[PDB]
Amino acid sequence: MKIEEGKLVIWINGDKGYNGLAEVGKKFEKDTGIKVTVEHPDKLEEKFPQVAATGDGPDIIFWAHDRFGGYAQSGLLAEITPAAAFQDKLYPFTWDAVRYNGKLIAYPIAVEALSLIYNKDLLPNPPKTWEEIPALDKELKAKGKSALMFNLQEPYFTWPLIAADGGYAFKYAAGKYDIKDVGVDNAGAKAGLTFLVDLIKNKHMNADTDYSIAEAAFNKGETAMTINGPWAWSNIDTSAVNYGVTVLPTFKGQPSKPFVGVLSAGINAASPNKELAKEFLENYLLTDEGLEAVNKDKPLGAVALKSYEEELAKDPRIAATMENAQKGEIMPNIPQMSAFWYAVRTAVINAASGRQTVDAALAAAQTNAAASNINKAKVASVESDYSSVKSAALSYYSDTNKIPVTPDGQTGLSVLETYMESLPDKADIGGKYKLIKVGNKLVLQIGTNDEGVTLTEAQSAKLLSDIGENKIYTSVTADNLGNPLTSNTKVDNKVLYIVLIDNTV
Numbered sequence: 350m351k352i353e354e355g356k357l358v359i360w361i362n363g364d365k366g367y368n369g370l371a372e373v374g375k376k377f378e379k380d381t382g383i384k385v386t387v388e389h390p391d392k393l394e395e396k397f398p399q400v401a402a403t404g405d406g407p408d409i410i411f412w413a414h415d416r417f418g419g420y421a422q423s424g425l426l427a428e429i430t431p432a433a434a435f436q437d438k439l440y441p442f443t444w445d446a447v448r449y450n451g452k453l454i455a456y457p458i459a460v461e462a463l464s465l466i467y468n469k470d471l472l473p474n475p476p477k478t479w480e481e482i483p484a485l486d487k488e489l490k491a492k493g494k495s496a497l498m499f500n501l502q503e504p505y506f507t508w509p510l511i512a513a514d515g516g517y518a519f520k521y522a523a524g525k526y527d528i529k530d531v532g533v534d535n536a537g538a539k540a541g542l543t544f545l546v547d548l549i550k551n552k553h554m555n556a557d558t559d560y561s562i563a564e565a566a567f568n569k570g571e572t573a574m575t576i577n578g579p580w581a582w583s584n585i586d587t588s589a590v591n592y593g594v595t596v597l598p599t600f601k602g603q604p605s606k607p608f609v610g611v612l613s614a615g616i617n618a619a620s621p622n623k624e625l626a627k628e629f630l631e632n633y634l635l636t637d638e639g640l641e642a643v644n645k646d647k648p649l650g651a652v653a654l655k656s657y658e659e660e661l662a663k664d665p666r667i668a669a670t671m672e673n674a675q676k677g678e679i680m681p682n683i684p685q686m687s688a689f690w691y692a693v694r695t696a697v698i699n700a701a702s703g704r705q706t707v708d709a710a711l712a713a714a715q716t717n718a719a720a721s722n723i724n725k726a727k728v729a730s731v732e733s734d735y736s737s738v739k740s741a742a743l744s745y746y747s748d749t750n751k752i753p754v755t756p757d758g759q760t761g762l763s764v765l766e767t768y769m770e771s772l773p774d775k776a777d778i779g780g781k782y783k784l785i786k787v788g789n790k791l792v793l794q795i796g797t798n799d800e801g802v803t804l805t806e807a808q809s810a811k812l813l814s815d816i817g818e819n820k821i822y823t824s825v826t827a828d829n830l831g832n833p834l835t836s837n838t839k840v841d842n843k844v845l846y847i848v849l850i851d852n853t854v
């Protein structure tokens with residue numbers, strides 16, 4: 350005989366101190382008999398909302414606090430309600446990061462802020478300004494080195510520059526974020542992104558530079574500077590680089606403003622062991638010993654627990670972290686933050702690769718950042734249309750034994766006129782409706798080559814949840830369905846296909 354439900358499963362990102370965390374888990378097991386399994390899946394922050402209640406979902410999820418309001422709004426998180434004496438153990442600033450609509454929705458663990466990390470031998474006096482970096486690169490490259498490499502792919506890393514001269518996410522005033530006032534396309538954001546795009550165009554960094562490339566370059570002494578958070582310090586310690594951690598460079602005289610993240614731990618609403626999860630987080634992790642185990646594996650940054658932060662505060666890398674944090678902004682935790690990040694990610698990549706101007710990239714990002722809720726309405730509409738057409742097609746085929754197809758040389762859904770209350774023309778996600786045969790399937794084509802659908806990451810996820818798998822495709826042959834839509838995929842002005850009838854014998 351054996352038991353089940355005698356284990357806590359924890360998810361935490363791959364760049365954090367998960368082995369240190371597993372040590373805390375071992376102590377918890379020793380006291381309670383409850384096994385603790387730490388995992389670090391890829392894309393855990395995207396995975397969690399689509400498997401939270403399945404039993405493949407974790408009991409505890411770790412991420413920066415910016416992700417948790419969306420989780421909370423979807424009802425995925427247990428409310429956390431620590432006693433007053435426990436709340437007193439942690440900085441009030443950090444509790445603010447995990448408060449959403451008046452309720453605490455996670456435990457705060459540590460304050461993270463990006464810093465400028467520099468090779469003290471190569472560069473004793475790091476630049477105080479972004480503007481002097483092109484020339485510094487020139488000089489260093491005369492010596493077989495580069496000035497600066499950092500992850501250009503994630504907007505977390507480029508945002509400090511974009512925000513420096515005035516860029517912002519959602520307008521904030523008196524405790525509230527205005528989800529229809531977005532600042533990614535103002536003069537400041539433009540100037541910031543233009544500067545980065547020019548750094549690339551003037552050969553001061555490659556547009557494909559990512560995390561592992563930047564890390565490798567700095568830790569092997571090939572570049573004089575990188576931009577990274579506290580988790581990164583471990584690997585540089587083991588390297589031969591003598592490094593400093595310092596203020597980010599200014600842009601147009603203004604400090605760089607990184608988005609400040611609080612590593613946080615949420616408890617799954619569906620967990621059968623919510624109180625044991627609270628015990629683990631409050632009385633095992635959030636102790637000097639618990640945080641030290643994690644911190645010695647990968648540094649946490651400035652921790653939320655006062656007693657242990659007071660020990661860490663003497664470290665100049667921690668003072669630098671707090672300096673950059675105070676010059677930046679705390680991330681909003683609101684549900685719309687995901688939309689913002691996805692929008693800005695695409696804008697920087699498209700601007701950097703020359704696909705769009707800075708203006709068009711940011712113009713589109715501004716719209717996208719503010720579109721999460723309307724995008725839900727657009728998906729709901731297409732689902733309505735699809736349902737109607739599917740029902741009508743099946744009723745038609747039931748009556749006639751014939752498959753309803755849009756005739757040659759025409760378009761639209763006129764063949765189903767008789768079977769529908771109203772004739773759909775174009776989808777709310779864009780694209781004209783058409784009925785086509787693909788092999789022995791009836792397929793609803795939405796859009797044409799020149800004029801297709803547009804879907805965000807979130808819309809595609811929603812579309813798939815509701816319509817199901819093996820229905821939605823981004824390509825067809827003339828005999829088969831091709832590339833299926835995945836919860837991942839972005840779609841940008843492309844044709845979409847949804848199966849209406851699987852088989853005509």
Ligand SMILES: OC[C@H]1O[C@H](O[C@H]2[C@H](O)[C@@H](O)[C@@H](O[C@H]3[C@H](O)[C@@H](O)[C@@H](O[C@H]4[C@H](O)[C@@H](O)[C@@H](O)O[C@@H]4CO)O[C@@H]3CO)O[C@@H]2CO)[C@H](O)[C@@H](O)[C@@H]1O
Nearest residue numbers: 362364392394395413415416461503504505610690691694
């Ligand atoms: O399809 C594109 C990519 O989509 C997925 O990444 C998304 C995330 O799901 C979003 O949540 C968001 O990510 C933010 C993140 O929420 C925010 O905390 C911050 O992340 C920091 C983190 O705080 C820090 O501790 C450390 O881990 O580094 C992170 C940054 O690397 O900033 C992120 C934004 O850069 O937006 C991204 C899309 O950019 C998916 O994970 C990707 O694999 C996928 O390519």
